[PDB]
UniProtKB/Swiss-Prot annotation, chains B, F, G, H:
Record organism: Arabidopsis thaliana (Mouse-ear cress)
Localization per record: Nucleus
Taxonomic lineage from the root: Eukaryota, Viridiplantae, Streptophyta, Embryophyta, Tracheophyta
Physiological role: Acts as a transcriptional repressor. Negative regulator of jasmonate responses. Connects the JAZ proteins and the non-JAZ protein TIFY8 with the TOPLESS corepressors.
Residues spanning the membrane: none
Subunit structure: Component of a complex at least composed of TOPLESS, TPR2, TPR3, TIFY4B/PPD2, MYC3/ATR2 and TIFY3B/JAZ12. Interacts (via C-terminus) with TIFY10A/JAZ1; TIFY10B/JAZ2; TIFY6B/JAZ3; TIFY6A/JAZ4; TIFY11A/JAZ5; TIFY11B/JAZ6; TIFY7/JAZ9; TIFY9/JAZ10; TIFY3A/JAZ11; TIFY3B/JAZ12; TIFY4A/PPD1; TIFY4B/PPD2 and TIFY8 (via TIFY domain). Interacts with TOPLESS. Interacts with PAT1H1.
Induction text: By jasmonate.
Gene name of the record: AFPH2
Family per record: Belongs to the Ninja family.
Note: Unlike the JAZ proteins, the stability of AFPH2/NINJA is unaffected by jasmonate.
Protein name: AFP homolog 2
Swiss-Prot record, chain C:
Effect of N176H: Aggregates formation
Domain LisH: 4-36
The protein's assembly and partners: Tetramer. Interacts with D53. Interacts with WOX1. Interacts with MOF1.
Protein name as catalogued: Protein TPR1
The gene coding this protein: TPR1
Effect of mutating F74A: Loss of interaction with EAR motif-containing full-length proteins
Effect annotated for changing K71A: Loss of interaction with EAR motif-containing full-length proteins
Tissues of expression: Expressed in panicles, stems, leaves, spikelets and seed endosperm.
Outcome (variant: Y68A): Loss of interaction with EAR motif-containing full-length proteins
Complete-protein stretch covered: 1 to 204 of 1129
Length: 198, 7, 200, 202, 202, 7, 7, 7
């Protein structure tokens, strides 16, 4: 990508947000990988929308890219798992354990066993390391604080955490100039943006 | 400490 | 929306497609409701991604807008239901029957009952009208043919099915002109940003 | 079976009850089919123990024996079904509907359809015929009243509903007499060891 | 003593068996705790009826009564667990692990840990010690082979494993003798009415 | 009378 | 027209 | 001997 194209994505991001296309904004952020939206990330973590969180993240890093992005996913899947235990859905808890958490077993053998053994507890807070866990809403908040730090420290997010700042509707402003350049000369000043004004 | 843990 | 703004969305759609941001293209199609992408729709129906299908459609019509769009959702939700039965997931089948299909009962009480009674069959192919449903793959395909017709006839989609045609990268070309307009107000020649107007 | 043998089963029932072997008493009632114990049946219906209810009944009648015994099983399985709906366990509700209730369809096509369609209601009390079903506890009670009538009128149960009346421990008394008859044949009359072989003095 | 009511149970047991009341035989075996029917136990272990297996055992011993009977319950519950794993029912496996296997957690922390971890294997035969557990049928039979050694060696079963020796139908001949004691008291003479009350002509 | 029904 | 049906 | 074990 050029820096022109990269900059153009940002203008588009601003435009889409102003026109209130909310889901398109975050799909664009994700697929371009140019801007990571913390506010959005927090909102999704609090709502516990775990599939969307991992999907949004996936535009910026994969699970095994580095030790930072590896702990990010681990933390998310650990909370997913604990919530499953907490509503006593042991069917879901085991599924998460095998599908989502097993990748971390390869290099953390003992930890994977320790996490597995929480299945046999009446309450996982019987484990002293998890004894400090207070409710879903609070646990999510606590975890979110940890994630924000991990992302801000992640070298793959390094140039991605700050939106530029622009006068509103910069894209519309540029478009207007093109009409000035086109719709000048030959025709001034409803017709399209599809072809040049003459 | 970037090691994964329960805590 | 002006026709300016509407056309600008189309430019954006072309750009996004060229940069291969596929998912962003379809979110924009959906949220703007300006262009319905058949190719995409087909791809998702074949994949059985019903959640996304209904979500994409929701950008263009509600279930009760008209008899065409009503039959479209009905067909989609019926196939959803039958697939649930076919994988023997009767918990999901009942969930679909109440959440998705119950709205159609009011208008057809008898069909809803007939469809409900399929829960108790060993195979819904015991019903003669459904005795012909041979595959998940094939059924989706048959159904898709029907949806395309329903969509093409639907008055809410009628003017939304054909993309305009533009030379490649029209938006990139327009942006270029704004840079030409900015720098022609400069003193002498002979980039930096699109964020503020460029000068010397 | 002789009526001697039949009577012996009753003695045993009394003995088993006195020794408080609770489950053995009702297995014997069931397997012999000689006595249907209403008191026990009621207790189990209130408790909602449906698998044991149908198993106890199965010692006396099958579902298709007669129109009384048909309605009895239908009522039990209907309540079973409604309870599943009431706890919103639609997975269980459909399992019941297909395994237990489908047998009644062949001869009731329309009712089976009507019952099936209760799955799609927010609450089956939206159906006017069921609009009065207020409690699991109360429903069981109402239904139980109906079953008692059906059982008492059922021709297969008609001579099985009343226990005889006996002095306490009749079996122990009889056993005692057998020991008296054994030892009165003695010409040295210690002592008597066991019941496994006849006693003698020696 | 109560050596009577114990003896009287065997007589009743024998009778119940002659009349083919199978389930009454085993409830009584279980509830009296007087005779352990190995033949029945094996039949139920092969059939995998673990609930009936364990409740039958309960009439005889608890999990913590002695080291033998505690290996007895563990081996059964382990098998219960592995079977769930093998049919890929991970939900049932966790419940078995927690309700049933969890008792052994305390003195065998580590064994319980190793055993929990089988949930995450694609097939638990990937574990070293389980590399030969192959088939359900064989697993049940192999375990049953040792359970048998364990039940027989257990002090609580040692006197309960072998049935007494009796002429067939010892209870009926006794009833016959008791009625004979009734009628050599009466005048004047082979015609019976009931066992409920004592026989009198004259 | 003896025929099956819902209530 | 566009009647809903099973087939 | 009577120790509980995996196999």
């Amino acid at each position: 990508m050029s820096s022109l194209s990269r900059e153009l994505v940002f203008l588009i991001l601003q435009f889409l947000d102003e026109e209130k296309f909310k889901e398109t904004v975050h799909k664009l952020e994700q697929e371009s990988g140019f801007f990571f939206n913390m506010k959005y990330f927090e909102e999704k973590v609090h709502a516990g929308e775990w599939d969307e969180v991992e999907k949004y993240l996936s535009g910026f890093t994969k699970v095994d890219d580095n030790r930072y992005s590896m702990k990010i996913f681990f933390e998310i899947r650990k909370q997913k798992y604990l919530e499953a235990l907490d509503r006593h859905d042991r069917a879901k808890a085991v599924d998460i354990l095998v599908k989502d958490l097993k990748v971390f077993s390869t290099f953390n053998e003992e930890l994977y066993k320790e996490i597995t053994q929480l299945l046999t507890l009446e309450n996982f807070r019987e484990n002293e390391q998890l004894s400090k866990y207070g409710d879903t809403k609070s646990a999510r908040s606590i975890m979110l604080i940890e994630l924000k730090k991990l992302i801000e420290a992640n070298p793959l997010f390094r140039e991605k955490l700050v939106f530029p700042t622009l006068k509103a509707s910069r894209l519309r402003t540029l478009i207007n100039q093109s009409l000035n350049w086109q719709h000048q000369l030959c025709k001034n000043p409803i017709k399209t943006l599809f072809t040049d004004h003459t | 400490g970037l090691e994964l843990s329960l805590g």
